[PDB]
RNA sequence: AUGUUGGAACAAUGUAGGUAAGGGAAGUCGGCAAGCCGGAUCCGUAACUUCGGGAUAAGGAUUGGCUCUAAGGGCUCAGCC
RNA sequence: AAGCGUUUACUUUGAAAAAAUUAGAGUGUUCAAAGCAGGCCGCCUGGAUACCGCAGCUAGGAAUAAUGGAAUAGGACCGCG
RNA sequence: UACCUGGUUGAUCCUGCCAGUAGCAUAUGCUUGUCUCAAAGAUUAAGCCAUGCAUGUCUAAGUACGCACGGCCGGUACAGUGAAACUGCGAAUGGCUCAUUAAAUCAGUUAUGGUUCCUUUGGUCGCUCGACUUGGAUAACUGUGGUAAUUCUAGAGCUAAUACAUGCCGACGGGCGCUGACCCCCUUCGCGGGGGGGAUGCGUGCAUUUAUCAGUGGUGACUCUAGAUAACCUCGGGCCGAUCGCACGCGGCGGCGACGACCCAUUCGAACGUCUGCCCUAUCAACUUUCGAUGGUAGUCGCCGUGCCUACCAUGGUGACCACGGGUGACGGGGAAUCAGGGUUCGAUUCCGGAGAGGGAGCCUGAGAAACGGCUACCACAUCCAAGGAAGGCAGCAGGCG
């Protein structure tokens, strides 16, 4: 090519968006922002395809510019905004707040959070950066360059930031036994405690995660995101709670739900 | 074919012309194109000569020295109003605008006036007063958060060195057993 | 134009590559700067990413450094004596990185005569007529004289470095790359570094 | 011994002409559990492409092979043998790839047939992209 | 002392040397005669062959002057020839 | 709890492993090719799952197939001067 | 469903091939009532193209004196629309085709600690010691025109910037050091030792470059980031608001914004490498090189690593495990047909990545092109001409010829 890509094919869209292929040849190309293209979910998909308020793309265009959608403390009027992990999309008209949390599968789950829960979110830091005048810096998953952080926050800890002020409240130390959120891969959407850390110099470190039901599994540290200390989470949890119980009993639960109600 | 300023010939030549060159109208940004231009020295191979009379002679031609074609537009910028009427830098120049009367059939007699550019208005002064609030906001915020961090850096300092004395006391206690 | 491409030449084993595309814009190469001695004539050129590179063509001064005394000063370059890459860059006096050039000594000599205030250069027989350094040699405070007298513990200089101070022409090596940033900074040859090219310059003369 | 070229080769990081009244030789660790050799620390070789006294960083894959040629100066040629599985005929085939690996002169006694351990880094030359990390002695060869 | 004499003229035919616009062997039994190439350095060199040759095959480039640089040695590491 | 403990091929496991396509779960497009929906007097839900060989990483095993140990001992341990 | 049949003989059993048998396209012949999906100028010609269309774009918030419309509460300037034009952005995406190309593209895996970055997001940007807003061009317009003719423009009056250059009051009242006038105290016969203060000026924001020195925070490992000293501040100079719109509440301050930039991370690309994988061919066995061939040193250039290139050196590097070379009716892969099991054939073709716009070559702008629905030349084809000159690239959707 001779420059950056601007279009996006419907076939080339990621599988967790669950967009049907019979509608259009193209897919909503996400705009650049604090999250990457693949694991984010555009605001047009969250409204038209997830919540079904809107039918067509022009209908999404009008609603976003009525200034009724407030993503994580700032109103964005772009239909293809890269809404990443746990962006607190707050809707003022109906008094309803959405935080983008993964389901037990790889898809984003439509999770309604309480308004007092909407003021804070958990961000995973990436590096401790020294500024031009001996200024410590932290860079979160959504590229929040927070100067003067708490000095005990390390490379892969998570900070409970506050949305209306843009500053942190607490932080969770990366240690074994703490709760975790597997953000990526085949174990995408899993919730479990951390049981073992394996060191690999040069290569990628892999961390074993014990599930709440005792289904221990491994995951590299790049797709690992702690969510709380011990067995106590710091946010609300969707139904399923990230277990990935095997497909033999989703056959059982789906069959039992139909016959019980009739 | 138009003739080009400073080409030092009398015939016709072809030249690459970019933006800023005469006898060329670019369409794309940085567009370059060859243009056939005539020489600058005038000979008997010309059709039309554009002539500009600098000093008027004592004789009066009926075509040009008699026909008065006035200005087309009035001065628009605020500072250019001051130099036209030899005003000062303190008085108001808004009433000294060069406006024109408008009269034609089918419409009422109206009057149109230009917008005075680069004129001091309370909106710009408020905007100037708005950006100095950000400078007061910035300088206070850097001093507030650095002092909070310096207090925070003192907060961690008492606990870090207190726990240092636990290892040193352990280093003596383990060696005593 | 002249390009920087690896696919235009042979394989490791010796086979010949066959091109599958024409010349790309990111493989671009430009003609050399080849800056000389003269008044400052530096041409700025736009490079990849919308940045600027300073193509120097004539340079006269440079911020050379004297690292033993932890001092650096701007001095005018006069001559080019040695270049390790090619001998035609000495005859045609061209400045590139790692060139042995000649500079005047007065910017560094006055610093020795101000901060230490001792006679360097100054072949015996003639005294300073402006009398400014003579004033600076004497007339110290009594309490600062002891601090001044402790400056003479390290006021010794090597004979080879002192020898080029006699004629006023110091050998110095270019450290900055001139055709890119436009400057001609560097450092003065000292000790083992200085005595190496003195053998080579003598070998150049014979 | 050293300095046999047109220019003056030296370690760029250190300064060797400070005011006086040996050389403060620069050397760095390499990582991945690799122990820096004694000869690099105490020797007088200077080379910009040495993994310990030069400005090269070891990253990426770590491989191993057998040295076959040493007529080249400051760089050597190693041999790596492997078998490629063909899915049609359930057999293999002997295939070799002889890449060029830089040999820092810190490793002094290196013989043809020694099993060398290399490390990936930035491309040193047109074909050289690997540098010697340790030299394991060949099998036997007590004499 | 110009080959067993000199001086003055500069006609044709001569003998011996040369030069010729355009064509380039159409001249002539017949390229007869005349003409082209030419030394040296760096490339390159065919068919055939008795493998030794053909071969300086054929066909290309360069050559001046001046100012420098590098390399190739003897006598006690530097100096001197 | 952390680290080191002959190396592989081989075997088992885990991660990383675009979609579309392939096999395959559910779904009366009236059937089917298809498609991802849909059903109940706002709710209930789905849009699974499988491999990705061959190549590369990590973790259990020590049968088979390789290489090597000390016999001019610069051999292995224990204190050492 | 893992399957056979006929044919050599006077007749037999074999080997053996030929021909039947069933799939899958490609074309073609005959014929055809309904409905739902769906391919369709790839194979020979990446051959040539008449004509039509395919990339343009304004919000309350960059310029509004075009009555071209239009409100009257005007003299406190433009009510408010509004063609045009200056400016900003996109035009480097998408679409078509598969000509070139055989460790090359490409596929799996890793690295950029070897790099550049539009846009978006989050942070910085009174820190520097000297203005209630600087300047003059120009487009639109009036008017003179030329050429057969261009999306050709020439001249004369003008008139604006979120176009172009320029730059400060303030924060700013003082702090830190270095020159350090000069002064004070103790002790010593006495020079001498120590404790200190100190007018004055200079330098002191980040950014670029050179030299030197100790370890706030990390990496598997830095010559990392930060810190200190000494200077430098690219005139073909790095910034540090000389913008616009809505409510407006109290000498001047406040709320909601858009735009604008320096720098850092972020998204996004692009680019080189790392290990493995590719059709046939020996009537291709030696190939590569001082015209770079493989390495070392020092430099140039490049966004950076690098013989990418240059200068000086060594003679090196690949190959019978098929190097090199030739052909390819070869863009590669995910995949398609077909099979019990294994395999065979195909993949121009919707997704990814590469290449191109008739064949080369070179370049302007732009962050990103060696762009061709951009230019500059040559080659081949083709167009109008007044014979002076001008102008083109459908392997973009149609469509026409071959």
Can you spell out the DSSP letters for chain B?
--B-SS---SSEEEEEE-TT-TT----STT--EEEEEE-SS--SS-S-------S--SS--SSSSS-----SS---BHHHHHHHHT--SSS--STT---EEE--TTS--EEE-PPPBS---HHHHHHHHHHHHHHHHHHHHHHHHHHHHHHHHHHHHHHHHHHHHHHHHHHHHHHT-
Asked if residue A118 lies in contact with residue A99, where contact means CB atoms within 8 angstroms, the answer is yes
Distance from CA of C89 to the nearest CA of D (A): 14
Q: How far apart are CA C169 and CA C102, in angstroms?
A: 6
Q: Any idea what the Cα angle at residue A47 is, between residues A42 and A50, rounded to 5°?
A: 90
Q: In angstroms, how far is G19 C1' from D90 CA?
A: 37
Looking at chain A, which runs of residues are DSSP E strands? 41-42, 69-71, 82-83, 88-91, 96-102, 108-113, 120-124, 128-130, 136-139, 145-147, 158-162, 167-172, 179-182, 191-198, 206-211, 217-220, 224-229, 232-233
Alpha-carbon radius of gyration of chain D? 18
Asked if residue A21 lies in contact with residue A10, where contact means CB atoms within 8 angstroms, the answer is yes
| β partners of residue C194 | none
Residues of A whose CB is below 8 A from D32: 201-202
**Tally of domains within chain C:** 3
Q: Residue D33's CB: how many other CB atoms inside 10 A?
A: 6
Q: Any idea what the Cα angle at residue C100 is, between residues C95 and C102, rounded to 5°?
A: 90
Tell how strand C61-66 and strand C186-188 pair up. Answer: parallel
Residues of D whose CB is below 8 A from A202: 31-32, 59, 62
C178 lies in the same domain as C150: no
**HSE-up of residue C52 (Cα within 13 Å, Cβ side):** 7
Alpha-carbon radius of gyration of chain C? 23
Which of chain F's bases lie under 7 Å from a protein CB?
Answer: 2-3, 10, 14-20, 25, 35-37, 44-49, 53-59, 67-69, 71-72, 74
A91 lies in the same domain as A131: no
A167 lies in the same domain as A226: no
Nearest by Cα to C36 from C84, C86, C101: C101
Residue with tokens 């507030």: B144
- Integer CA distances (angstroms), B43 to B14, B35, B50, in order: 19, 21, 14
A165 lies in the same domain as A221: no
Q: How far apart are CA A219 and CA A221, in angstroms?
A: 6
Q: Does B31 touch chain A (CB under 8 A)?
A: no
A101 lies in the same domain as A208: no
Tell me if A256 is assigned to some domain. Answer: no
Which structural domain, as residue segments, surrounds residue C142?
106-168
- Residues (29-58, chain B) with CB within 7 Å of strand G atoms: 29-36, 47-48, 50, 52
Q: Residue C91, CB, less than 7 Å from strand E?
A: yes
Q: Residue C86, CB, less than 7 Å from strand E?
A: no
Strand order in the sheet with A96-102: A69-71, A88-91, A96-102, A108-113
Which of chain E's bases lie under 7 Å from a protein CB?
Answer: 68-70, 78-79
**Tally of domains within chain A:** 3
Q: How far apart are CA C190 and CA A83, in angstroms?
A: 61
Question: Following DSSP, what letter does each residue of A62-100 receive, concatenated?
Answer: HHHTTT-EEETTB----TT-EE-TT-EEEETTTTEEEEE
Residue D34, both tokens: 């690799």
Residues of D whose CB is below 8 A from A199: none
Resolution (Å units): 2.9
Residues of A whose CB is below 8 A from B152: 148, 150-151
Burial of C179 from C-beta contacts in 10 A (0-12 / 13-18 / 19+): buried
Domain C-terminal end among A116, A135, A155: A116
Q: How far apart are CA B8 and CA B103, in angstroms?
A: 51
Q: Pseudo-torsion of CA D105, D109, D110, D113, nearest 10°?
A: 180
Asked if residue A32 lies in contact with residue A42, where contact means CB atoms within 8 angstroms, the answer is no
Asked if residue A71 lies in contact with residue A87, where contact means CB atoms within 8 angstroms, the answer is yes
Asked if residue A149 lies in contact with residue A140, where contact means CB atoms within 8 angstroms, the answer is no
Q: Is the dihedral of CA C81, D6, C65, C136 positive or negative?
A: negative
Q: Residue A250, CB, less than 7 Å from strand F?
A: yes
Q: How far apart are CA C199 and CA C197, in angstroms?
A: 5
Q: How far apart are CA A96 and CA A47, in angstroms?
A: 13
Q: How far apart are CA B93 and CA B81, in angstroms?
A: 7
Residue A162, classed as helix, strand or coil, is strand
C2 lies in the same domain as C85: no
Tally the residues of chain B: 177
Domain C-terminal end among A47, A82, A116: A116
Nearest by Cα to A240 from A97, A50, A109, A99: A109
Q: Residue A196's CB: how many other CB atoms inside 10 A?
A: 12
Nearest by Cα to A43 from A23, A26, A24, A63: A63
C90 lies in the same domain as C133: no
Residue A163, both tokens: 């949305």
Residues of A whose CB is below 8 A from B156: 151-152
- Integer CA distances (angstroms), D25 to B79, C95, D12, D19, in order: 69, 30, 11, 17
Neighbours, chain C (3 or more CB pairs < 8 A)? D
| β partners of residue A104 | none
C163 lies in the same domain as C110: yes
Residue with tokens 């279009």: A7
C164 lies in the same domain as C180: no
Distance from CA of C193 to the nearest CA of D (A): 7
Nucleotide nearest to C91 (CA to C1'): E68
| Structure determination technique employed | cryo-EM
Q: Residue D106's CB: how many other CB atoms inside 10 A?
A: 21
Which structural domain, as residue segments, surrounds residue A152?
121-171
Distance from CA of C19 to the nearest CA of D (A): 18
Nearest by Cα to D69 from D59, D61, D79, D60: D79
B23: left (phi over 0), alpha (psi -120 to 50) or beta: left
Residues ending a continuous segment of chain B before a break (C–N > 2.5 Å): none
Asked if residue A152 lies in contact with residue B156, where contact means CB atoms within 8 angstroms, the answer is yes
């Amino acid at each position: 090519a001779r420059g950056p890509k601007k279009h996006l094919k419907r076939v080339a869209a990621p599988k967790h968006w669950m967009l049907d292929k019979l509608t259009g040849v193209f897919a909503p190309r996400p705009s650049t922002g604090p999250h990457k293209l693949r694991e984010c979910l555009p605001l047009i998909i969250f409204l038209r395809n997830r919540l079904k308020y809107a039918l067509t793309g022009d209908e999404v265009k009008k609603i976003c510019m009525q200034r009724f959608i407030k993503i994580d403390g700032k109103v964005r009027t772009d239909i293809t905004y890269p809404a990443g992990f746990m962006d607190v999309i707050s809707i003022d008209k109906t008094g309803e707040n959405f935080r983008l949390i993964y389901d037990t599968k790889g898809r984003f789950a439509v999770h309604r959070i309480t308004p007092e829960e909407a003021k804070y979110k958990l961000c995973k830091v990436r590096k401790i950066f020294v500024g031009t005048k001996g200024i410590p810096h932290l860079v979160t998953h959504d590229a929040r360059t927070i100067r003067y952080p708490d000095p005990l926050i390390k490379v892969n800890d998570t900070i409970q930031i506050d949305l209306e002020t843009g500053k942190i409240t607490d932080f969770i130390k990366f240690d074994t036994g703490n709760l975790c959120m597997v953000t990526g891969g085949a174990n995408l959407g899993r919730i479990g405690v951390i049981t073992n850390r394996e060191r690999h110099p040069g290569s990628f470190d892999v961390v074993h995660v014990k599930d709440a039901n005792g289904n221990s599994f491994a995951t590299r540290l790049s797709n690992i995101f702690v969510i709380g200390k011990g067995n106590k989470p710091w946010i609300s949890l969707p139904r399923g709670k990230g277990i990935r119980l095997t497909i033999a009993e989703e056959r059982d639960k789906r069959l039992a739900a139909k016959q019980s109600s009739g | 074919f138009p003739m080009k300023q400073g080409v030092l010939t009398h015939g016709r030549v072809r030249l690459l012309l970019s933006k800023g060159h005469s006898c060329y109208r670019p369409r794309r940004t940085g567009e370059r194109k060859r243009k056939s231009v005539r020489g600058c020295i005038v000979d008997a191979n010309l059709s039309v000569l554009n002539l500009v009379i600098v000093k008027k002679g004592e004789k009066d031609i009926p075509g040009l020295t008699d026909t008065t074609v006035p200005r087309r537009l009035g001065p628009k910028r605020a500072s250019r109003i001051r130099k036209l009427f030899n005003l000062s830098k303190e008085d108001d120049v808004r009433q000294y605008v060069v406006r024109k009367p408008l009269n034609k059939e089918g419409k009422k007699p109206r009057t149109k006036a230009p917008k005075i550019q680069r004129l001091v208005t309370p909106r710009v002064l408020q905007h100037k007063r708005r950006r100095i609030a950000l400078k007061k906001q910035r300088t206070k915020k850097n001093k507030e958060e650095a002092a909070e961090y310096a207090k925070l850096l003192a907060k961690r300092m008492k606990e870090a060195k207190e726990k240092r004395q636990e290892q040193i006391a352990k280093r003596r206690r383990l060696s005593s057993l | 134009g002249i390009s920087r491409d690896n696919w235009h030449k042979r394989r490791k084993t010796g086979g010949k590559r066959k091109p599958y595309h024409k010349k790309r814009k990111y493989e671009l190469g430009r003609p050399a700067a080849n800056t000389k001695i003269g008044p400052r004539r530096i041409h700025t050129v736009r490079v990849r990413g919308g940045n600027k590179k300073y193509r120097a063509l004539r340079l006269d001064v440079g911020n050379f450094s004297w690292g033993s005394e932890c001092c650096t000063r701007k001095t005018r370059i006069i001559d080019v004596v040695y270049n390790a890459s090619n001998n035609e860059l000495v005859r045609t006096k061209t400045l590139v990185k790692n060139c042995i050039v000649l500079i005047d000594s007065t910017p560094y000599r006055q610093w020795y005569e101000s901060h230490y205030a001792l006679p360097l250069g100054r072949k015996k027989g003639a005294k300073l007529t402006p009398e400014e350094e003579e004033i600076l040699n004497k007339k110290r405070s009594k309490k600062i004289q002891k601090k001044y007298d402790e400056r003479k513990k390290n006021a010794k200089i090597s004979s080879l470095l002192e020898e080029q101070f006699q004629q006023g022409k110091l050998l110095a090596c270019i450290a900055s790359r001139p055709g890119q940033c436009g400057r001609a900074d560097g450092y003065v040859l000292e000790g083992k570094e200085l005595e190496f090219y003195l053998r080579k310059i003598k070998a150049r003369k014979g | 011994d050293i300095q046999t070229e047109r220019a003056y080769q030296k370690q760029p990081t250190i300064f060797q002409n400070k005011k006086r009244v040996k050389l403060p030789r620069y050397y760095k660790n390499i990582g991945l559990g690799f122990k820096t050799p004694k000869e690099a620390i105490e020797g007088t070789y200077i080379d910009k492409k040495c993994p310990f006294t030069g400005n090269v960083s070891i990253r990426g894959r770590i491989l191993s092979g057998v040295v076959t040629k040493m007529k080249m100066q400051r760089t050597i040629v190693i041999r790596r043998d492997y078998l490629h599985y063909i899915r049609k005929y359930n057999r293999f085939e002997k295939r070799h790839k002889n890449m060029s690996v830089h040999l820092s002169p810190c490793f002094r006694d290196v013989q043809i047939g020694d099993i060398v351990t290399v490390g990936e880094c930035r491309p040193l030359s047109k074909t050289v992209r690997f540098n010697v990390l340790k030299v394991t002695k060949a099998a036997g060869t007590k004499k």
